[PDB]
Amino acid sequence: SHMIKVLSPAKINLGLWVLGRLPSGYHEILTLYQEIPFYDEIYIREGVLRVETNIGIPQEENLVYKGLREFERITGIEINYSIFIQKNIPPGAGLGGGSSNLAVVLKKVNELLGSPLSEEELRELVGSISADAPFFLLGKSAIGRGKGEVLEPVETEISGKITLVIPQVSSSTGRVYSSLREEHFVTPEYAEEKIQRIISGEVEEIENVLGDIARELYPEINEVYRFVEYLGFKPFVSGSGSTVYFFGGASEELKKAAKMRGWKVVELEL
Ligand SMILES: Nc1ncnc2c1ncn2[C@@H]1O[C@H](COP(=O)(O)OP(=O)(O)O)[C@@H](O)[C@H]1O
Ligand SMILES: Nc1ccn([C@@H]2O[C@H](COP(=O)(O)OP(=O)(O)O)[C@@H](O)[C@H]2O)c(=O)n1
Ligand SMILES: [Cl-]
């Protein structure tokens, strides 16, 4: 009852660098987050606390449910909202779809409940569940530090066409970080120079070691990477895979080869 709809956007990493290993066993990163016009559709209704999707994600596993239940635990308030998410952003595509879902729902539910959580409290809540989530409370363009949750909004000189080519294989972030050799690490200073160049519009400066690894672990990601090269474009990888992107439009040759393999092609403009 009283149905409202909210969009839940995807992100790409315009470069990612691993800086070190933290006491938790998690890795410190530098990355440039970019919100893209590619959305999940979320329906928010008054009713029993429920989180359903259209792709069969178990409610207990759902980041949105874990968020709303933690909301209840922290605030003592009973959340009486039914959530249905139409999942267009594929899980494991390195596009932070789950984190986006988490962030947008909790921000809206907070607002609906008269904002019992401050910006600091909302951000720390979503961040405790997912490091990529706080970015989606800002959107647009931001440098991500720590594990990604320490953010600095920036304005980039990047505009024009960006095309995503999404393989079928779902990339595991855990497996990718586990294959990461201590020699793949870089200094924050190196990564900072790279990011500054990318912000200025020098997209050829984008790189991502997790993509190097994803390509070694999941051959289909490598196939997509190689195919984008064959088309005469520099390919880039989002998150820990699986999505390969490039700066140019989708051609009929790409589209046809995608349909034959089941690759999702997403044509964006910034
Ligand atoms: N609402 C959600 N949407 C997508 N994935 C989710 C959600 N809740 C939990 N997950 C988990 O996150 C994994 C995929 O991560 P996702 O955030 O979609 O992209 P990535 O982590 O590759 O950037 C899934 O395998 C799934 O188990
Ligand atoms: N910044 C990060 C993010 C993830 N990881 C690793 O990747 C695993 C899976 O990441 P995830 O965010 O998809 O799942 P969680 O285990 O965080 O719930 C984590 O358990 C970490 O071991 C990391 O080392 N550093
Ligand atoms: Cl890359």
mmCIF file of C-alpha atoms in Angstrom, residues 75-258:
data_model
loop_
_atom_site.group_PDB
_atom_site.id
_atom_site.type_symbol
_atom_site.label_atom_id
_atom_site.label_comp_id
_atom_site.label_asym_id
_atom_site.label_seq_id
_atom_site.Cartn_x
_atom_site.Cartn_y
_atom_site.Cartn_z
ATOM 1 C CA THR A 75 16.939 2.063 16.086
ATOM 2 C CA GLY A 76 14.370 -0.097 17.939
ATOM 3 C CA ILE A 77 11.798 0.925 15.301
ATOM 4 C CA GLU A 78 9.777 -1.767 13.528
ATOM 5 C CA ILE A 79 10.190 -1.611 9.751
ATOM 6 C CA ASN A 80 6.867 -2.353 8.079
ATOM 7 C CA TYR A 81 7.797 -2.234 4.393
ATOM 8 C CA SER A 82 7.596 -4.768 1.547
ATOM 9 C CA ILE A 83 10.472 -4.484 -0.916
ATOM 10 C CA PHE A 84 10.445 -5.902 -4.421
ATOM 11 C CA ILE A 85 13.548 -5.506 -6.566
ATOM 12 C CA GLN A 86 13.582 -6.034 -10.324
ATOM 13 C CA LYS A 87 17.209 -7.089 -10.841
ATOM 14 C CA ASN A 88 18.566 -5.678 -14.121
ATOM 15 C CA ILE A 89 22.135 -5.257 -12.828
ATOM 16 C CA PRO A 90 23.485 -8.830 -12.903
ATOM 17 C CA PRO A 91 24.894 -10.206 -9.613
ATOM 18 C CA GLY A 92 28.670 -10.716 -9.800
ATOM 19 C CA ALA A 93 29.149 -8.361 -12.728
ATOM 20 C CA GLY A 94 31.360 -6.015 -10.652
ATOM 21 C CA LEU A 95 28.732 -3.284 -10.911
ATOM 22 C CA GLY A 96 27.774 -3.118 -7.219
ATOM 23 C CA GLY A 97 24.078 -3.864 -7.761
ATOM 24 C CA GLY A 98 23.539 -5.339 -4.278
ATOM 25 C CA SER A 99 25.337 -2.432 -2.600
ATOM 26 C CA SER A 100 23.253 0.048 -4.628
ATOM 27 C CA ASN A 101 20.014 -1.732 -3.641
ATOM 28 C CA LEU A 102 21.114 -1.662 0.011
ATOM 29 C CA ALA A 103 21.993 2.040 -0.113
ATOM 30 C CA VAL A 104 18.918 3.377 -1.943
ATOM 31 C CA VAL A 105 16.339 1.402 0.093
ATOM 32 C CA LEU A 106 17.827 2.321 3.487
ATOM 33 C CA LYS A 107 18.137 6.009 2.568
ATOM 34 C CA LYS A 108 14.451 6.038 1.510
ATOM 35 C CA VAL A 109 13.155 3.988 4.465
ATOM 36 C CA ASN A 110 15.096 6.306 6.806
ATOM 37 C CA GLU A 111 13.399 9.327 5.162
ATOM 38 C CA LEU A 112 9.975 7.628 5.387
ATOM 39 C CA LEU A 113 10.492 6.961 9.115
ATOM 40 C CA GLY A 114 11.254 10.651 9.767
ATOM 41 C CA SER A 115 15.052 10.279 9.437
ATOM 42 C CA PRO A 116 15.927 8.540 12.767
ATOM 43 C CA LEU A 117 19.477 8.083 11.419
ATOM 44 C CA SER A 118 21.839 10.937 10.565
ATOM 45 C CA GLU A 119 23.928 10.908 7.358
ATOM 46 C CA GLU A 120 26.863 9.586 9.420
ATOM 47 C CA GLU A 121 24.718 6.836 10.973
ATOM 48 C CA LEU A 122 23.111 5.782 7.687
ATOM 49 C CA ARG A 123 26.512 5.682 5.934
ATOM 50 C CA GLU A 124 28.172 3.652 8.716
ATOM 51 C CA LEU A 125 25.209 1.239 8.722
ATOM 52 C CA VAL A 126 25.311 0.418 4.974
ATOM 53 C CA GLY A 127 29.151 0.370 5.090
ATOM 54 C CA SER A 128 29.146 -2.233 7.873
ATOM 55 C CA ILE A 129 27.299 -4.543 5.430
ATOM 56 C CA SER A 130 29.042 -3.501 2.164
ATOM 57 C CA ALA A 131 32.069 -1.255 1.443
ATOM 58 C CA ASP A 132 30.659 -0.281 -2.006
ATOM 59 C CA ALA A 133 27.325 0.883 -0.498
ATOM 60 C CA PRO A 134 28.234 4.373 0.857
ATOM 61 C CA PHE A 135 29.156 5.450 -2.695
ATOM 62 C CA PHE A 136 25.505 5.013 -3.701
ATOM 63 C CA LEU A 137 24.485 7.522 -1.005
ATOM 64 C CA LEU A 138 26.427 10.077 -3.067
ATOM 65 C CA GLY A 139 26.346 8.842 -6.663
ATOM 66 C CA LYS A 140 27.993 10.757 -9.521
ATOM 67 C CA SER A 141 31.826 10.587 -9.361
ATOM 68 C CA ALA A 142 33.920 9.801 -6.272
ATOM 69 C CA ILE A 143 37.380 8.590 -5.256
ATOM 70 C CA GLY A 144 36.992 5.625 -2.865
ATOM 71 C CA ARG A 145 39.522 4.944 -0.091
ATOM 72 C CA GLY A 146 39.933 2.456 2.770
ATOM 73 C CA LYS A 147 37.893 -0.444 1.396
ATOM 74 C CA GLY A 148 35.930 2.019 -0.750
ATOM 75 C CA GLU A 149 33.748 3.543 1.989
ATOM 76 C CA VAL A 150 35.942 6.617 2.573
ATOM 77 C CA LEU A 151 34.797 8.831 -0.268
ATOM 78 C CA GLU A 152 35.835 12.054 -1.938
ATOM 79 C CA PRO A 153 33.393 13.497 -4.502
ATOM 80 C CA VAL A 154 35.145 14.669 -7.673
ATOM 81 C CA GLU A 155 34.260 16.262 -10.999
ATOM 82 C CA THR A 156 35.775 14.480 -14.011
ATOM 83 C CA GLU A 157 36.402 15.514 -17.622
ATOM 84 C CA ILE A 158 35.066 12.128 -18.747
ATOM 85 C CA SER A 159 32.038 12.269 -21.046
ATOM 86 C CA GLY A 160 30.671 10.447 -24.086
ATOM 87 C CA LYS A 161 29.842 6.839 -24.889
ATOM 88 C CA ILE A 162 30.576 3.873 -22.600
ATOM 89 C CA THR A 163 29.529 0.341 -23.460
ATOM 90 C CA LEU A 164 29.317 -2.576 -21.038
ATOM 91 C CA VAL A 165 29.754 -6.140 -22.227
ATOM 92 C CA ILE A 166 28.628 -8.479 -19.471
ATOM 93 C CA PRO A 167 29.656 -12.165 -19.610
ATOM 94 C CA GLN A 168 27.433 -14.914 -18.188
ATOM 95 C CA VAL A 169 29.930 -16.141 -15.557
ATOM 96 C CA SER A 170 29.490 -14.530 -12.136
ATOM 97 C CA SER A 171 32.775 -13.250 -10.721
ATOM 98 C CA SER A 172 33.521 -14.047 -7.068
ATOM 99 C CA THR A 173 35.176 -11.101 -5.294
ATOM 100 C CA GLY A 174 36.484 -13.467 -2.594
ATOM 101 C CA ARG A 175 38.229 -15.788 -5.053
ATOM 102 C CA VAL A 176 39.787 -12.848 -6.962
ATOM 103 C CA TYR A 177 41.309 -11.223 -3.836
ATOM 104 C CA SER A 178 42.601 -14.636 -2.679
ATOM 105 C CA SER A 179 44.663 -15.072 -5.870
ATOM 106 C CA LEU A 180 46.124 -11.592 -5.405
ATOM 107 C CA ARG A 181 49.894 -11.823 -4.923
ATOM 108 C CA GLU A 182 51.583 -9.326 -2.587
ATOM 109 C CA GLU A 183 53.517 -8.075 -5.643
ATOM 110 C CA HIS A 184 50.307 -6.900 -7.394
ATOM 111 C CA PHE A 185 50.060 -4.217 -4.675
ATOM 112 C CA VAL A 186 50.962 -0.596 -5.406
ATOM 113 C CA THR A 187 51.727 2.503 -3.324
ATOM 114 C CA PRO A 188 48.936 5.050 -2.692
ATOM 115 C CA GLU A 189 51.147 7.662 -4.396
ATOM 116 C CA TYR A 190 51.334 5.684 -7.656
ATOM 117 C CA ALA A 191 47.552 5.112 -7.629
ATOM 118 C CA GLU A 192 46.885 8.791 -6.843
ATOM 119 C CA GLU A 193 48.790 9.981 -9.913
ATOM 120 C CA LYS A 194 46.872 7.453 -12.057
ATOM 121 C CA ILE A 195 43.483 8.581 -10.664
ATOM 122 C CA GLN A 196 44.240 12.318 -11.162
ATOM 123 C CA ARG A 197 45.019 11.594 -14.838
ATOM 124 C CA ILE A 198 41.776 9.619 -15.266
ATOM 125 C CA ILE A 199 39.778 12.482 -13.669
ATOM 126 C CA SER A 200 41.368 14.869 -16.215
ATOM 127 C CA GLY A 201 39.854 12.589 -18.905
ATOM 128 C CA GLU A 202 42.862 10.366 -19.653
ATOM 129 C CA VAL A 203 40.888 7.104 -19.701
ATOM 130 C CA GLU A 204 43.793 5.111 -21.198
ATOM 131 C CA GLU A 205 45.283 5.436 -17.679
ATOM 132 C CA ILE A 206 42.593 3.106 -16.249
ATOM 133 C CA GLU A 207 43.845 -0.247 -14.932
ATOM 134 C CA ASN A 208 42.636 -2.833 -12.448
ATOM 135 C CA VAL A 209 44.684 -5.747 -11.120
ATOM 136 C CA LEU A 210 41.510 -7.560 -9.964
ATOM 137 C CA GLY A 211 40.501 -7.618 -13.659
ATOM 138 C CA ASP A 212 43.864 -9.200 -14.582
ATOM 139 C CA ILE A 213 43.077 -11.932 -12.033
ATOM 140 C CA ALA A 214 39.378 -12.304 -12.978
ATOM 141 C CA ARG A 215 40.541 -12.890 -16.575
ATOM 142 C CA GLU A 216 42.863 -15.678 -15.401
ATOM 143 C CA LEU A 217 40.216 -17.290 -13.182
ATOM 144 C CA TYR A 218 37.202 -16.989 -15.506
ATOM 145 C CA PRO A 219 38.173 -17.567 -19.194
ATOM 146 C CA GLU A 220 34.877 -16.037 -20.455
ATOM 147 C CA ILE A 221 35.875 -12.629 -19.024
ATOM 148 C CA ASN A 222 39.153 -12.986 -20.953
ATOM 149 C CA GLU A 223 37.165 -13.939 -24.096
ATOM 150 C CA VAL A 224 35.110 -10.737 -23.755
ATOM 151 C CA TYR A 225 38.277 -8.704 -23.088
ATOM 152 C CA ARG A 226 40.021 -10.165 -26.170
ATOM 153 C CA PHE A 227 36.910 -9.642 -28.329
ATOM 154 C CA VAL A 228 36.711 -5.946 -27.373
ATOM 155 C CA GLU A 229 40.395 -5.670 -28.375
ATOM 156 C CA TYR A 230 39.577 -7.355 -31.703
ATOM 157 C CA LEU A 231 36.918 -4.663 -32.279
ATOM 158 C CA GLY A 232 39.709 -2.081 -31.956
ATOM 159 C CA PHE A 233 38.818 -0.744 -28.504
ATOM 160 C CA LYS A 234 40.769 -0.692 -25.247
ATOM 161 C CA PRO A 235 38.794 -2.877 -22.797
ATOM 162 C CA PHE A 236 38.609 -2.208 -19.055
ATOM 163 C CA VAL A 237 37.233 -4.290 -16.173
ATOM 164 C CA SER A 238 34.820 -3.181 -13.428
ATOM 165 C CA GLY A 239 35.317 -4.278 -9.806
ATOM 166 C CA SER A 240 36.574 -7.845 -9.616
ATOM 167 C CA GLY A 241 34.831 -8.662 -12.913
ATOM 168 C CA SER A 242 32.819 -9.784 -14.682
ATOM 169 C CA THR A 243 31.919 -6.653 -16.682
ATOM 170 C CA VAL A 244 34.276 -5.480 -19.427
ATOM 171 C CA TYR A 245 33.683 -1.921 -20.624
ATOM 172 C CA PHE A 246 35.050 0.386 -23.320
ATOM 173 C CA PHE A 247 34.704 3.990 -24.477
ATOM 174 C CA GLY A 248 32.726 3.733 -27.714
ATOM 175 C CA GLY A 249 29.359 2.558 -29.007
ATOM 176 C CA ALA A 250 28.105 -0.953 -29.645
ATOM 177 C CA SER A 251 28.403 -2.030 -33.278
ATOM 178 C CA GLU A 252 26.171 -4.602 -35.001
ATOM 179 C CA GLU A 253 29.142 -6.988 -35.063
ATOM 180 C CA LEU A 254 29.407 -6.766 -31.251
ATOM 181 C CA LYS A 255 25.623 -7.018 -30.692
ATOM 182 C CA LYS A 256 25.358 -10.139 -32.908
ATOM 183 C CA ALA A 257 28.342 -11.879 -31.287
ATOM 184 C CA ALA A 258 26.901 -10.942 -27.882
#
